[PDB]
Design a protein around this ligand. Structure first.
Ligand code: CA
Ligand code: CA
Ligand code: CA
Ligand code: CA
Lengths: 91, 91
């Protein structure tokens, strides 16, 4: 596999690692999303410690209003973070 | 860096490797996009050999009509392919 292919596999893997913990196995509830950010995005995002921030993150990502983050919504989140990373080598 | 963070970095890196070849260094023209798919997605996508397919792929991905694929458009493409992969381990 190429580096790009390996990256795509890692996205699927980490999503499912967290989504499969509780409830709907194909979606992230707030606690699953919080843990994914805190454990897996610690170099790119400040740790989430406040319920208000958990709530705002889910509200931002949950485009279909079901209170959870599905795979498409997670990929949109990945796109936003990856876009923000540009500041640290271009702008 | 986590597996997720490494994946994000690989997305940025591959996009720029290809986007920086010609013209606008921040966007993929048709030839750059074709080579990215053929070299870097050979296990997930059939090789592109026909101009009609090149054109359709760009037409599908180019949401702002400038005839190129920017980083956001590229991330949308990655999301489509990563979603399609689910068929090979879920249903
Ligand atoms: Ca879940
Ligand atoms: Ca949702
Ligand atoms: Ca270019
Ligand atoms: Ca475009």
């Amino acid at each position: 596999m190429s580096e790009l292919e390996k990256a795509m596999v890692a996205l699927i893997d980490v999503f499912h690692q967290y989504s499969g913990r509780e409830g709907d196995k194909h979606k992230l509830k707030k606690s699953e999303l919080k843990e994914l950010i805190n454990n897996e995005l610690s170099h790119f995002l400040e740790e989430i410690k406040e319920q208000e921030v958990v709530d705002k993150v889910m509200e931002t990502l949950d485009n279909d209003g079901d209170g959870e983050c599905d795979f498409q919504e997670f990929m949109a989140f990945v796109a936003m973070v990856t876009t923000a990373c540009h500041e640290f080598f271009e702008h």
